[PDB]
Design a protein that fits this description.
This is part of a larger assembly, with two copies of chain A. By secondary structure, chain A is largely without helices or strands. At the A-B interface, loops of A face loops of B. The structure holds 2-acetamido-2-deoxy-beta-D-glucopyranose (NAG) (2 copies). One 2-acetamido-2-deoxy-beta-D-glucopyranose binds near residues 46 and 47 of chain A. Chain A: This is Spike protein S1. It is classed as viral protein/immune system. The entry lists the keywords SARS-CoV-2, spike, antibody, nanobody, VIRAL PROTEIN-IMMUNE SYSTEM complex.
């Protein structure tokens, strides 16, 4: 929920919740998508590649 | 006619401003009123344990 005099959003990390959308008052919630991981499970360069 | 008014001065000061879920100011505590107000503000919480 937001109020007319509250068009900027930031809780602790200054997230881009302040997109009040002056064009068409529409507060948007910014959030990065999945980061991802990586790890190689290999039986060694001796057995097989 | 008849009427009345108040006159009072204001000075700088810092409180702990509490906003509920809706987004409306409901609870405020200053730092220059009581030791509790003080120790309460530093902990950034309205509840202080023993
Ligand atoms: C490579 O062969 C096996 C693979 O499991 C390994 O146990 C051995 O120690 C290795 N030997 C040499 C000569 O690379
Ligand atoms: C803020 O809370 C609700 C928002 O859902 C609103 O209906 C209500 O009038 C406001 N005040 C209180 C005390 O809930």
């Amino acid at each position: 929920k937001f109020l007319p005099f509250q068009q900027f959003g930031r809780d602790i990390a200054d997230t881009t919740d302040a997109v009040r959308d002056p064009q068409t008052l529409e507060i948007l919630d910014i959030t990065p998508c999945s980061f991802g991981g990586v790890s190689v499970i290999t039986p060694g360069t001796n057995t097989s590649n | 006619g008849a009427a009345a008014y108040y006159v009072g001065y204001l000075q700088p000061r810092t409180f702990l401003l509490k906003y509920n879920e809706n987004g409306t100011i409901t609870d405020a505590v200053d730092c220059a009123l009581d030791p509790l107000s003080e120790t309460k503000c530093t902990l950034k919480s309205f509840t202080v344990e023993k």
